[PDB]
Amino acid sequence: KKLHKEPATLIKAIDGDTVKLMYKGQPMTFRLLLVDTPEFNEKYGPEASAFTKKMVENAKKIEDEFDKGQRTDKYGRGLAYIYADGKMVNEALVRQGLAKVAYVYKGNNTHEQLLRKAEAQAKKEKLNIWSE
Ligand SMILES: Cc1cn([C@H]2C[C@H](OP(=O)(O)O)[C@@H](COP(=O)(O)O)O2)c(=O)[nH]c1=O
Ligand SMILES: [Ca+2]
């Protein structure tokens, strides 16, 4: 079983780890897989929100990639990896210490090792959430 990115259409960025897509012609919230950004009113929340917003809004295009397992969560949100001009937003947040690796469920964990490699680098550099 292989993962494949597909073309996506942005309506708007919502916060650090959620975006609104026009998915098959319906507005739908997507939650980024394997990451957790702070809430806007928590430390680094505004920064994570603005980093995801600039990355998706300013991209020439965005793509979504489901993993192998559940595609929608218990709140109806789609669960995907999101790419902006080919760069994974989920990884970039982690690499900048603006999200933690989190919500790792077996069966939607394809990019776990990639993301924990990014988090280890953000922790070594003491970035943001990991700053001292
Ligand atoms: C990332 C992700 C979150 N979730 C759920 C778990 C958390 O629900 P509960 O705590 O209600 O159990 C919720 C966290 O989302 P937010 O971080 O967007 O608040 O989203 C999944 O079910 N699957 C996922 O892959
Ligand atoms: Ca969150």
Q: Could you say how many structural domains there are in total? A: 1
| Biggest beta-sheet profile | 7 strands, mixed
CATH class descriptor name: Mainly Beta
Bound molecules: thymidine-3',5'-diphosphate, calcium ion
In one word, what is the shape? globular
Task: Give a count of the beta strands, DSSP E runs of length 2 or more.
Answer: 9
**CA-CA gap between termini:** 41 Å
In the CATH hierarchy, the third-tier topology is known as OB fold (Dihydrolipoamide Acetyltransferase, E2P)
Task: Tell me the Rg in angstroms.
Answer: 14 Å
Structural class, judged by helices and strands? alpha+beta
What percentage of residues falls in helices of 4 or more residues?
25-40%
Give me the CATH architecture, please. Answer: Beta Barrel
By DSSP (H or I, 4+ residues per run), the number of helices equals 3
Strand content: 25-35%
Element order: H for helix, E for strand: EEEEEHEEEHEH
